[PDB]
């Protein structure tokens, strides 16, 4: 669906530009064969997490959502992905949701950014 104007991931509020930058980064990094710290990852629906997607069918991917992005890390300069993620449709790039580890119900779980 359209990228939202903003999203609140456990207190980190991001803009549409931050979200777009994250997806664009993921797509470029996959194309470049240089997936920073091996992101993107696959995202699977796990309904206990109460995360709605607005993009349609999977497959879905997730990539770190950061300020002043895109997220990048390398063997010579590790950077944490932090807690926040964009979810997008792997085959197209289209936006699905933003999620976070912050405040999730279980270890390594995600919860929806609001
Ligand atoms: N719905 C979901 N919830 C949490 N993790 C998920 C997920 N779908 C896939 N994952 C995967 O599980 C890791 C967390 O242990 C995630 O990596 P990150 O926490 O983003 O580093 C995904 O690879
Ligand atoms: Ca929800």
Centre of ligand 1 from the C-alpha of residue 74, in Å: 20
Residue-range domains of the chain with CATH? 1-114 (3.10.450.30)
Tell me the C-alpha distance between 52 and 47, whole Å. Answer: 9
Experimental method: X-ray
Report how far ligand 2's centroid is from the alpha carbon of 52 (Å).
5
Which distant-in-sequence residues (6+ apart) come within 8 Å of 78 by Cβ?
37
41 is annotated as an active-site residue: yes
Contact 51, 100 (CB under 8 A): no
Q: Give the active site residue among 10, 20, 58, 101.
A: 101
Cα dihedral angle (37, 41, 46, 49), rounded to 10 degrees? 50
Return binding residues.
Answer: 29-32, 37, 39-49, 85, 108-110
Q: CA-CA distance, 97 to 113, in Å (whole number)? A: 8
At 83, which helix (H) or strand (E)? none
């Amino acid at each position: 669906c359209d990228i939202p104007q903003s999203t609140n991931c456990g207190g980190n509020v991001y803009s549409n530009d931050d979200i777009n930058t994250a997806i664009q980064g993921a797509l470029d990094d996959v194309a470049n064969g240089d997936r920073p710290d091996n992101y993107p990852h696959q995202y699977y629906d796990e309904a206990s997490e109460d995360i709605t997607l607005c993009c349609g069918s999977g497959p879905w991917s997730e990539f770190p959502l950061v300020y002043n992005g895109p997220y990048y890390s390398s063997r010579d300069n590790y950077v944490s992905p932090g807690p926040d993620r964009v979810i997008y449709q792997t085959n197209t790039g289209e936006f699905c949701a933003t999620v976070t580890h912050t405040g999730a119900a279980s270890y390594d779980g995600f919860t929806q950014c609001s």
